[PDB]
Amino acid sequence: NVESFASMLRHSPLTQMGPAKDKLVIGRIFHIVENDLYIDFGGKFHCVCRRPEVDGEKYQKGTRVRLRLLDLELTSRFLGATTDTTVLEANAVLLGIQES
Amino acid sequence: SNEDLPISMENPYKEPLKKCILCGKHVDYKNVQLLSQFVSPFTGCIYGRHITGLCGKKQKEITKAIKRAQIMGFMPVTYKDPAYLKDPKVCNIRYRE
Amino acid sequence: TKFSIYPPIPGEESSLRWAGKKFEEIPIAHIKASHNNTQIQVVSASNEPLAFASCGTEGFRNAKKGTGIAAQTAGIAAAARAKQKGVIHIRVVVKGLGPGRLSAMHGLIMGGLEVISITDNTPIPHXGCRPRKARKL
Amino acid sequence: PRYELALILKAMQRPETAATLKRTIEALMDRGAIVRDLENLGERALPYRISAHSQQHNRGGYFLVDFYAPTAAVESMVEHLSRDIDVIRGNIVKHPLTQELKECEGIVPVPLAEKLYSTKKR
Amino acid sequence: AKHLKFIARTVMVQEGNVESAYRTLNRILTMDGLIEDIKHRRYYEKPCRRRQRESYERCRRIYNMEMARKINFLMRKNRADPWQGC
RNA sequence: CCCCACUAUGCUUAGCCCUAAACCUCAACAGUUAAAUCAACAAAACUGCUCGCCAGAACACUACGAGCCACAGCUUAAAACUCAAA
Numbered sequence: 174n175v176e177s178f179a180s181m182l183r184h185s186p187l188t189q190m191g192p193a194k195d196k197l198v199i200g201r202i203f204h205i206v207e208n209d210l211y212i213d214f215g216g217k218f219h220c221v222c223r224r225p226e227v228d229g230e231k232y233q234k235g236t237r238v239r240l241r242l243l244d245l246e247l248t249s250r251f252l253g254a255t256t257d258t259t260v261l262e263a264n265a266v267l268l269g270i271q272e273s
Numbered sequence: 274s275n276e277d278l279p280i281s282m283e284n285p286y287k288e289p290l291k292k293c294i295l296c297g298k299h300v301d302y303k304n305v306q307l308l309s310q311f312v313s314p315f316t317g318c319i320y321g322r323h324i325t326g327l328c329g330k331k332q333k334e335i336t337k338a339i340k341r342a343q344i345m346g347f348m349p350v351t352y353k354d355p356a357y358l359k360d361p362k363v364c365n366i367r368y369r370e
Numbered sequence: 371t372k373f374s375i376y377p378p379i380p381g382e383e384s385s386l387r388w389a390g391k392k393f394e395e396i397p398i399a400h401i402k403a404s405h406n407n408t409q410i411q412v413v414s415a416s417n418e419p420l421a422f423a424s425c426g427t428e429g430f431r432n433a434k435k436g437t438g439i440a441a442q443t444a445g446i447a448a449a450a451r452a453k454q455k456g457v458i459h460i461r462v463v464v465k466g467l468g469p470g471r472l473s474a475m476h477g478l479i480m481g482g483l484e485v486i487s488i489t490d491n492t493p494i495p496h497x498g499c500r501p502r503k504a505r506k507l
Numbered sequence: 508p509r510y511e512l513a514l515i516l517k518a519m520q521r522p523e524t525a526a527t528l529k530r531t532i533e534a535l536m537d538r539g540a541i542v543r544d545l546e547n548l549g550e551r552a553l554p555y556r557i558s559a560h561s562q563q564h565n566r567g568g569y570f571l572v573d574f575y576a577p578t579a580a581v582e583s584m585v586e587h588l589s590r591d592i593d594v595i596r597g598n599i600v601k602h603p604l605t606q607e608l609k610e611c612e613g614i615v616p617v618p619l620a621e622k623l624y625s626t627k628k629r
Numbered sequence: 630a631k632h633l634k635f636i637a638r639t640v641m642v643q644e645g646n647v648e649s650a651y652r653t654l655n656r657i658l659t660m661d662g663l664i665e666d667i668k669h670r671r672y673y674e675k676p677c678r679r680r681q682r683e684s685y686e687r688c689r690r691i692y693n694m695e696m697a698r699k700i701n702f703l704m705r706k707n708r709a710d711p712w713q714g715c
Numbered sequence: 716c717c718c719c720a721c722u723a724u725g726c727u728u729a730g731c732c733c734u735a736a737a738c739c740u741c742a743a744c745a746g747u748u749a750a751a752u753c754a755a756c757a758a759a760a761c762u763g764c765u766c767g768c769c770a771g772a773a774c775a776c777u778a779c780g781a782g783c784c785a786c787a788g789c790u791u792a793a794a795a796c797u798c799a800a801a
């Protein structure tokens with residue numbers, strides 16, 4: 174009675190989410206560069222969001238935040254290209270901090 | 274076999290196709306008010322579809338209606354009739370800075 | 371009220387006035403900006419001529435006529451003769467893309483006239499006469 | 508077939524305007540037309556000055572005549588309107604309501620064209 | 630000639646600012662294509678030459694809009710190096 | 716070559732003439748994207764089938780013959796001499 178991969182995939186939160194556009198997700202700040210916050214939210218790629226002007230000092234490494242997802246992976250095919258160009262990061266909007 | 278395998282079907286999350294603001298509406302050469310919304314106020318020039326946002330079918334219908342109305346005596350050619358300057362702005366163009 | 375760049379429409383009831391005169395009553399400065407000359411005629415709203423000046427009538431000759439400072443001088447000359455006749459506010463109708471298109475308007479202002487509107491009437495045929503053949507340079 | 512006559516009439520008093528409309532609808536009937544409706548769009552300023560029959564016009568009465576006629580009546584009616592001195596401009600078009608508008612599902616997006624050039628290294 | 634006058638290509642001057650009115654008019658005529666049209670009409674452009682110009686202008690628009698689309702897409706990556714030293 | 720003037724001509728009607736880098740220099744129909752992908756460049760490489768066309772350069776959009784409302788024309792189209800290249 175070993176669970177199959179097809180079963181794991183069907184019942185994963187990422188599969189159950191459906192499309193990612195305009196979906197609220199919880200992220201975690203794992204890397205910070207100046208006012209650039211690198212946030213992991215459970216997907217393949219992280220998103221990079223600028224430090225908010227209000228309560229900027231509350232956003233630190235490990236701080237859990239609320240995001241509105243736009244794309245899991247930013248990719249596009251440009252004129253003459255044989256494959257899609259990927260920037261290797263997700264597109265998301267940082268809304269604020271998640272609190273209990 | 275296995276219940277958890279994916280099933281073949283059509284995309285359930287597919288968004289409905291977008292429609293032009295004139296989709297499903299009749300474009301008549303006598304409706305000069307509508308046609309005037311797709312000409313330049315200062316020169317009367319017909320706007321291209323990249324400004325009007327119309328589909329190819331309606332860009333043609335609007336264009337043919339404008340040309341018919343102009344030469345039949347319903348619509349001016351060299352300027353937008355001033356009566357229609359306060360109508361809704363549906364075209365994506367700004368002439369003031 | 372907010373400013374409208376669109377001119378007042380004749381027959382409608384506007385509140386805009388210039389020295390107690392309506393837009394339909396303001397004299398007109400006709401500027402013809404050619405490639406080799408600039409001609410300026412100021413006329414009344416009833417089409418009465420009031421002043422005429424061109425780069426040629428201001429003593430400029432040949433290629434000097436087709437310059438900005440030459441048109442500016444022609445504008446000042448027409449403004450002077452027009453101001454003597456009682457003109458302060460003018461509607462500018464400029465046809466042509468010559469060098470004296472804008473400079474001719476400056477001369478009208480430096481000459482004491484107030485421009486209340488600018489109209490382009492450069493002739494554009496909608497299909498018309500075949501222009502002369504291109505130049506080999 | 509079904510046609511629509513867009514009729515711009517000289518700005519006149521009510522009695523002369525009715526005589527012109529009656530004279531124009533009777534001309535259609537004499538040519539075999541079945542007149543369906545007559546609509547008044549109102550007197551208005553023309554979009555531009557129109558010279559017709561040695562006169563200059565700035566205002567006109569806009570009228571529509573919906574009618575059915577044989578195909579050969581159109582050419583004969585156009586000639587009749589050219590001679591009526593009270594008509595500024597008269598045009599006969601195929602009635603727009605006859606043409607049925609096909610349904611539209613929406614805008615089908617166009618993907619960027621692919622494989623226009625070989626993938627060899629240049 | 631048969632149309633009403635002082636409606637087409639007419640801009641009103643605000644507070645005696647004639648320079649801004651002329652710039653606005655010039656911007657109107659440019660965006661509507663009249664300036665380039667007037668210039669191209671000074672000498673007759675033969676049809677073969679017109680077709681070549683339109684083709685060149687259309688291919689330039691496609692290239693310029695596609696390069697602009699790629700610049701905007703990659704502009705987010707112009708941020709400071711997150712992994713400096715590695 | 717640059718500027719000005721003006722004609723044949725560009726337009727209509729009625730007949731001719733039948734030529735273009737008439738070239739998107741990429742024939743029609745049907746099919747494939749796997750194998751060896753493929754001289755180069757150009758607009759990726761091929762299969763079936765059919766018609767048309769091609770066989771060193773130049774002589775030669777020529778000569779002669781023939782046909783044509785064409786009479787300084789068009790279509791078809793060689794040879795001799797010459798070269799070891801084109």
Ligand code: FES
Binds near residue numbers: 295296612
């Ligand atoms: S999108 Fe349906 S008619 Fe324009």
Ligand SMILES: [K+]
């Ligand atoms: K040929």
Ligand SMILES: [K+]
Binds near residue numbers: 738
């Ligand atoms: K070619």
Ligand SMILES: [Mg+2]
């Ligand atoms: Mg001649």
Ligand SMILES: [Mg+2]
């Ligand atoms: Mg003709």
Ligand SMILES: [Mg+2]
Binds near residue numbers: 737
């Ligand atoms: Mg061709």
Ligand SMILES: [Mg+2]
Binds near residue numbers: 740
């Ligand atoms: Mg060939």
Ligand SMILES: [Mg+2]
Binds near residue numbers: 742743
């Ligand atoms: Mg064949």
Ligand SMILES: [Mg+2]
């Ligand atoms: Mg095929």
Ligand SMILES: [Mg+2]
């Ligand atoms: Mg040979």
Ligand SMILES: [Mg+2]
Binds near residue numbers: 776
């Ligand atoms: Mg030949």
Ligand SMILES: [Mg+2]
């Ligand atoms: Mg021969």
Ligand SMILES: [Mg+2]
């Ligand atoms: Mg012979």
